[PDB]
Subunit: 386 residues, 4 copies
């Protein structure tokens, strides 16, 4: 019955199940969770591991001795449960000092502090075994046009990421970076707002091989974009280092619903793509149990993230294995899309009268694509009517 | 009184003022315009030049002799008026053969035809003096998830652009390519949907130096993105080869309003950026006079595109020259944003106790950014209340 | 296997399967269909009836004799197949004369013509047995703020609808009106843009009982609104006279996908509501087979509209009949939502210390709503994992 | 220089300038303001009055004696400054007990409490002189489809508002209610999501004359709707009892920017409409100074709200008074829009051959509307280029 096991590589942030329910208009509805309890409960549900921001594990301002105590207790919970920590990240957004950003704050002293806070947590991530270090620049941006010269801000963003790459290289660490785009919220517009902008930026860094993307379902959907298409471009570029799964109903505030909620058909096509492409990284949930829920609802929501992934995986596998679907893909010429347009080369193409002078445009235009039949097979498989 | 001259480099597509007014729900409301008449009328309004798709100048299906006659008459109009042709593009979207795309159609024979149709028009663009060749892949995309394997489609898109680069290089032409992104419409989702995705794609081509972007105001706004921010990223990457100016009211169908309509504040910040960065390319209008208008309204709309640019240029220049604005930019630390975070280097940063151990986070957090005063100065300048 | 029969009351517009594929950027990809052939093909698929605009059945400009011939042939097709015509409407949007509207055109002579064209088609609708007459004011609106004084336009809209009500009453016809809202497209903003605005307007007509709404899935979703919620408000007001079913992926141009495509979960909740409320009107599809398709794809798309409704009906019925769902609805207090807050009356409420002075707010706040468990049961039922 | 005076009727909520800067991702950046200090500072800036939620003035949980002390100090500040309190409202959204709503919470005991909390604050509002009592049902709604039966929720919403109307009538109070719509945030979808839905709902209350709307600029723009058009419909219905002014950049989270920011052209058309229609109620700002700002920035932002209104008022008045604009309005037939379509009556219309049989549709279709010239005059006036 769609039971997860650690082999499915499902991971959760501490801040997901640990969200207390404060929103722009309301107070917390749940008590804080001890990270140790979250690790134990997640392990019981069949998760593989957990992720953290610095400030989720070590309260901001802790002394070195309190920091050591918090880490020790957490490591014991990992040892007791077999849970892993595949990813870590920095909180460069909650504290008022970051109100205009971390890496791109106008104040230079804040930028330096943001780098030092990040470096300290890279060391800890490596100690705990993380392979990916995420950067979500949630305060990098603006509400007004004159507040931020974007060219200068991109110079500062490149400088920061280049320095972090120098750090990991000089220390000999095996950890890679992933940039998490988001278009807006909490800033009016956030820099590097989509997967595309992040991919383009990485190509201007000094050591691009160290950097990839960590796209999030709801973030791209906040710009009305097709999330599977964006993931396909990231895969095509070799840059899908991590992925964040959740749900979102359209263009509005970031809802962080459980995975499978929101756009269910997009969730199907996402799972189809990840499984077909052989993505081997964590399936990470960055979601918020709604503030209507008590703790029993928190764990039901978390379990539902994993359940929905496993149902969609079954349905997408059945779709691709169905001989009638395989025939419909050929009827729609998906096989021809995969063949080179002109492996014969430019000159051969220019000399081929069948490509222009003698091409029957009307006969080609009259051929139906048969896409609606294909899409109804996909619908029937999703719904278990096949 | 804000009178354009050819030195302002304003250009218009033939298909803009020539739009007959057909929309998804309605018939044409205006007669077709002869391109020769459009060139003459635009020259009288103070435009610098015109642009064309192949099929706007030479009716689809024309014989070689009719093609020569259409080109000859057009060249005479250019000679008679002094108008230039800085940009040309291909129509790979109107004819039914392109219903599933040109470069990424599932049918291989259509892909070959699309390349041959494009190459024929590159030759003509060079003959007429164009410096930029635009590609808008308006039919490259899908309405349904199974219809298009995006990784295979990106392979086909790269193959097409690589072949075009081989062609221009082998012929010795001085013309560069610019990719025009759009998120949707007429396809449910279009490949390379934003400036970012296009910039990232270019970095995977064989000769990236030949390719840039041609962003359009309304296209990025159809994804709710900040158009000045996207242009800043394109400028930062060295890839703003051309720009398309129009207006758009939000996330909806592509309205193609005259420039200055839609988001007026974004238009101000765009002009500020283009003029401050020294962009020297054409200021091209890709707009549609609304179908409510007769021909007098067409020319009033076109004139308004240029007028609004010139008013906004004045206001942005006055904003930047105002000593009180210069003081407010320093109060908001725009000067510090332009300074390196750590020109002293990584090791110096790690050893600097003022960046972490002795950094007074509360004092830094208490400093206001003064962004609202700055933004109200910008508003006052835009409105001519300063 | 989810086979429709005429008893399911599925209906289609002639203009749906008859859409030739012209879009803002492209020519037609299919030949025109004779309405007689559409009636025959739809009847074979199991539809119950068809609907029409005047101009779909009788070409604009037809003489009285050609009009009679077109009607006679259509009536024969209805007689031969048993198909019904439950709804008709007027085309007040295609012809250039309607470029600024029909009922709210600034030109008074156009407004009078629009009323006369509508009245002529009301007579024909009654002759063919229609019970509902739809009005979609697709050209009523504006691209610019000064073009339309909305208060005067609403006066003109009320005048038009009041005159139509006087007409039907004076003739003794049993046909009711339904207003079809849409937020934009083809006008920049359309008057009466949502279900809510239309419901409010109706209350100011002279004979409100004659008027209801005809909401369309994709239209409300073009404003990012919850379509089931809007339908619930229409049902609560007694005004759901007809409904138009299709799919839409978010806030963008009107896609008119087949029903079930787009937001699949919203489609589930819509069918749940219609079936639970006992809606007895037609299930009408206002959709467009994508222009990628040939005629075989047209009929596959149409069949898919009906199939998806029937699958969702089964799943929603199974959800509501499941004892575990019934228990979860009580756990979430849906039973208490249905009970009056204060049937004891105002004074009793004011004197009840348990409602304020002695209310334990912390105990009430700590109760979870159990909504995530309920929603995962709904997901499991939708997907056939229960 | 655009200096406000109390005669301009500008008002501000205590929670606007008093917003501490907490957002979904960040802690407060400003200290709390004493309401007395806010009244004094606002009076110095030229505001006319202030508004409050219960919980902004009296901390939740206060004893009767602390409540009396808070009210006394506030009344002294009003007396010392001459500031008025034209509007008050209830906080039915912050405390965890309201996590599923107030008036439409599934738990009946919460619904009763929400009514008692509201009634207590109606008494206080009347004591302080308020004329309008606002209801913003920010927690009335859902994240999931099964959580809320909307028909039952509308019954509960009507019951609540009917009881409040009975209360004010029985006490003899001269205060009216205004419903403030919002489409989403903090709930996934909020009930009564737009001006239209609220207007329609009011018509089903027992005493509709007691209820109107309090629309907010950014709320309607979160659904991509035209705010001036919605205000026009509210004015046409006689229901614009109050208005909330702010700015919003598109369809995203509620930004609450200062008035004039966001969509500047929509702000112009709004002021034109309010001043032309003679709206006499408060011009209330429901905005948030961005959390980047210190207290000096708070007051600069507040001052900017009033400044921008007064600049736009001047520009709109100059637009309407310009003889060239008056001529352009006649050229566009705004005069004919204001004349009845058929004051001659139905029968005369049916017998008028000039309305159909002899109407020259082609001549009418060829007349341009001249809307682009009109809109460029409006642009020139807005920008002070006329």
């Amino acid at each position: 019955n769609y039971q997860p096991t650690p082999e499915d590589r499902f991971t959760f942030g501490l801040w997901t199940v640990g969200w207390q329910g404060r929103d722009p208009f309301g107070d917390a509805t749940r008590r804080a969770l001890d990270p140790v309890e979250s690790v134990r409960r997640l392990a019981e549900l069949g998760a593989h591991g957990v992720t953290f921001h610095d400030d989720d594990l070590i309260p901001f301002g802790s002394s070195d001795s309190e920091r050591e105590e918090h880490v020790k207790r957490f490591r014991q919970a990992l040892d007791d449960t077999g849970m892993k920590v595949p990813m870590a990240t920095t909180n460069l957004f909650t504290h008022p000092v970051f109100k205009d950003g971390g890496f791109t704050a106008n104040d230079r002293d804040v930028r330096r502090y943001a780098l030092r806070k990040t470096i300290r947590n890279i060391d800890l991530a490596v100690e705990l075994g993380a392979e990916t270090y995420v950067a979500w620049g949630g305060r990098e941006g603006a509400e007004s046009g004159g507040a931020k010269d974007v060219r200068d801000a991109l110079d500062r963003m490149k400088e920061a990421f280049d320095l972090l790459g120098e750090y990991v290289t000089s220390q000999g660490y095996d950890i890679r970076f992933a940039i998490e785009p988001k278009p807006n919220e909490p800033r009016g517009d956030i820099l590097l707002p989509t997967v595309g902008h992040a991919l383009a930026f990485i190509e201007r860094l000094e050591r691009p091989e160290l950097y990839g993307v960590n796209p999030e379902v709801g973030h791209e959907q906040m710009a009305g974009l097709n999330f599977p298409h964006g993931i396909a471009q990231a895969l095509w570029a070799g840059k899908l280092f991590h992925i964040d799964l959740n749900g979102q109903n359209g263009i509005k505030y970031d809802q962080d619903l459980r995975f499978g909620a929101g756009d269910l058909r997009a969730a199907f096509w996402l799972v189809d793509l990840l499984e077909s492409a052989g993505y081997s990284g964590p399936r990470h949930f960055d979601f918020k149990p709604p503030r209507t829920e008590d703790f029993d609802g928190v764990w039901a929501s978390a379990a539902g993230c994993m359940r929905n992934y496993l149902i969609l995986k079954e349905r997408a596998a059945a779709f691709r294995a169905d001989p009638e679907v395989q025939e419909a893909l050929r009827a729609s010429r998906l096989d021809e899309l995969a063949r080179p347009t002109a492996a014969d080369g430019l000159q051969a193409l220019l000399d081929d009268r069948s490509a222009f002078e003698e091409f029957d445009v009307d006969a080609a235009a009259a051929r139906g694509m048969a896409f609606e039949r294909l899409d109804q097979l996909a619908m029937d498989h999703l719904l278990g009517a096949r």
